[PDB]
Design a protein around this motif. Sequence first.
Motif, PDB file in Angstrom:
ATOM      1  N   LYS A 155       0.839  -1.200   0.000  1.00 37.84           N
ATOM      2  CA  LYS A 155       0.000   0.000   0.000  1.00 37.84           C
ATOM      3  C   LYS A 155       0.871   1.246   0.000  1.00 37.84           C
ATOM      4  O   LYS A 155       1.917   1.295   0.649  1.00 37.84           O
ATOM      5  N   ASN A 156       0.452   2.249  -0.761  1.00 33.99           N
ATOM      6  CA  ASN A 156       1.272   3.439  -0.904  1.00 33.99           C
ATOM      7  C   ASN A 156       1.414   4.176   0.427  1.00 33.99           C
ATOM      8  O   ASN A 156       0.471   4.250   1.221  1.00 33.99           O
ATOM      9  N   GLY A 157       2.619   4.694   0.675  1.00 33.73           N
ATOM     10  CA  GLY A 157       2.901   5.462   1.873  1.00 33.73           C
ATOM     11  C   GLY A 157       2.938   4.669   3.162  1.00 33.73           C
ATOM     12  O   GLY A 157       2.616   5.217   4.220  1.00 33.73           O
ATOM     13  N   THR A 158       3.327   3.398   3.112  1.00 31.34           N
ATOM     14  CA  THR A 158       3.302   2.535   4.286  1.00 31.34           C
ATOM     15  C   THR A 158       4.699   2.061   4.647  1.00 31.34           C
ATOM     16  O   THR A 158       5.659   2.187   3.877  1.00 31.34           O
ATOM     17  N   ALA A 159       4.786   1.477   5.836  1.00 28.21           N
ATOM     18  CA  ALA A 159       6.005   0.784   6.190  1.00 28.21           C
ATOM     19  C   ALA A 159       6.273  -0.353   5.212  1.00 28.21           C
ATOM     20  O   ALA A 159       7.395  -0.515   4.717  1.00 28.21           O
TER      21      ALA A 159
END
Length: 456
Positions: free
Chosen positions: A113-117
């Motif tokens: 998922k975009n912008g995740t760890a």
Amino acid sequence: TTVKIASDSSYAPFEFQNGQKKWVGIDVDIMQEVAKINDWKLEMSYPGFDAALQNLKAGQVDGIIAGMTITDERKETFDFSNPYYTSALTIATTKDSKLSDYSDLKGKAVGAKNGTAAQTWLQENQKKYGYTIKTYSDGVHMFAALSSGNIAGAMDEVPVISYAMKQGQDLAMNFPSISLPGGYGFAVMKGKNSTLVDGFNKALAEMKSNGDYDKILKKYGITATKKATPKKDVYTIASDNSFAPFEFQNDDKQFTGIDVDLLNAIAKNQGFKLKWNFIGFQAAVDSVQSGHADGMMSGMSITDARKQVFDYGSPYYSSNLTIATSSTDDSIKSWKDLKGKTLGAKNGTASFDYLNAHAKEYGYTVKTFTDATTMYSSLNNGSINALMDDEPVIKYAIKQGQKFATPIKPIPDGQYGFAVKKGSNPELIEMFNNGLANLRANGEYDKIIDKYLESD
């Protein structure tokens, strides 16, 4: 006199709406029991995580529980409770996938998922493993891509996947997981509302103590395991460069051993990441003591003197001294059979000291050796009748093929331990004790040991 707590607006399994449009989840259930345990009137709200922080800062809200990672940056603004959950990242696949290791992803497309760890991690390890990274806006789109075969694995949180499997999706977790440092906590504005933090912590301990915590996790598909919470991305472990069978290099020149295999196995079980430095026992000592290594695994005997400067995990190996004989010599079957024999020992060792102290007793002669090879060659050519050494060295020498036998019951000589500098890195002692306990129960422990010391 209401305790108002804000949370995220959709984050299963931590907070979300069920078939009744009713708010439920791990955070929701945990917060509600804490309130009851503290005789608090709880007023939950679900504006969403960023909005929750904004509302907390304005004092419009008392605290926040919304899968919030505890971080030093955030401690500049907030006060946290103890971690109530330690999440992790791993690769989900459809049930019918044969992939099980991060190496398998060579050539494959992987989602996050975009912008995740999960995104970040995939990037940090892409050069290593050689996968393509496809990124997605939400889980719906990511898993639809997993389901349709357009990615071969998808990286996300263990709890989120575990819950999806409980719901009945076509999902599997065959890969190892990576614990996320920090853990999730309950937060208040820094310096304010301390009694909430203390009330949260005290309640949480009861729920762990009375089983109500585990029951909540079981509710959402999560089987509570003992897991330490990492604080760093990676921990450095120093060790000796050559002490077979615990740390040594094989013919491909890669390091291996009981110490290597066991500690790596402990970390995999706990989701920690380790970096090894096989610099030498004393070098490891100084590096841990100087704060340049996080801990050491290097066949280290646990002693009161070392306890002055190290902290130890639970003992992991019973170090013994034992006699080696020629496997074709029927004449040595007990200590009393040693009268008239000469036995080899290395200079300055416990084997040396023990042989000396009982030599007059049993009527044998002790030949001192300074080189371990010349000792074992002498048993092999018969210039000595037997030797004494550390039990695992002899067993490994036997498994490697030396024609030896151990007719006499060994002598206990302490215990090996994992060490950190005293008062440093407590979560590392935790992860050692937890992981060791678990590998003893499923048998990975004995399997690692027999790998080096069991013969025929």
